[PDB]
């Protein structure tokens with residue numbers, strides 16, 4: 001497992017954020033894209049702002065973040081950029097719904113988002129379970145996500161990395177649970193059930209944030225919303241991100257071909273033409289319903305729904321040749 005150098009976490013301690021970035025970070029549609037060098041410092045800032053400067057021991061935090069960074073691989077999409085992207089969206093939702101969530105939860109959720117794709121390979125849970133690869137035997141379901149959490153704990157177990165040590169064993173065990181459920185929730189195979197339950201609970205008015213299982217379900221949908229948030233950016237960022245995703249999908253399809261298996265059209269680079277229709281279907285069946293139910297449960301998150309509506313509109317425009 002990769003460990004940051006002495007030169008990386010200390011430099012991060014030194015980092016400060018420009019004034020104009022402080023303002024824009026608060027926007028849902030903010031794109032971290034153009035600020036690569038500043039990405040670690042952006043997360044620190046977000047953590048300090050959301051949780052408090054007294055929250056974690058700075059030195060332990062810097063080690064943790066820079067070591068998380070080194071455990072993201074050089075893959076087209078499920079990389080370090082994705083991790084910070086997802087953490088930022090979480091920060092925006094949390095800032096607009098601050099007191100609905102406890103100190104511990106905001107700490108856990110921010111750290112969970114950063115680590116939620118730790119050591120991703122560019123391969124889906126479908127690939128691994130239908131090939132093997134020991135990970136699918138180690139985790140029969142949810143599968144990469146179980147691996148991501150395993151990695152999260154491993155990095156915490158590195159010397160001077162455990163940011164949660166100053167917590168009482170009660171709060172400590174809780175924050176791990178928060179992180180575990182939240183990371184697992186990022187398996188999209190689970191999202192569909194989750195959103196139906198939440199839809200059912202909201203429409204009937206059963207929904208109660210004092211109810212832990214309800215609260216667990218809300219957190220998981222927030223995770224889905226953050227995980228998918230590239231659909232909520234300005235169109236050219238969304239379109240550029242779509243390239244990265246397909247780069248990974250097609251590379252998975254290519255390894256499948258090498259091993260004598262036909263991949264689905266989504267992972268088939270020969271089926272490039274079907275992308276806009278595939279996107280349209282993803283927005284209609286996944287993204288739109290996600291951000292709709294989210295807006296219902298958390299009204300301040302509506303700009304997320306709006307941006308996704310806008311991007312759906314764009315994909316429709318591509319389909320009809322415009």
Ligand SMILES: CCCc1nc(C)c2c(C)nc3cc(OCc4ccc5ccccc5n4)ccc3n12
Nearest residue numbers: 227228229230231245265266271274275278279282
């Ligand atoms: C697994 C990553 C989840 C995810 N995060 C984002 C942020 C996206 C985004 C933005 N788009 C996604 C599109 C998908 O599949 C859609 C699809 C379905 C059938 C196809 C057939 C041929 C060509 C492309 C197809 N695409 C599947 C997952 C998508 N996705």
Ligand SMILES: [Mg+2]
Nearest residue numbers: 116117186187
């Ligand atoms: Mg994932």
Ligand SMILES: [Zn+2]
Nearest residue numbers: 116117186227
């Ligand atoms: Zn992800």
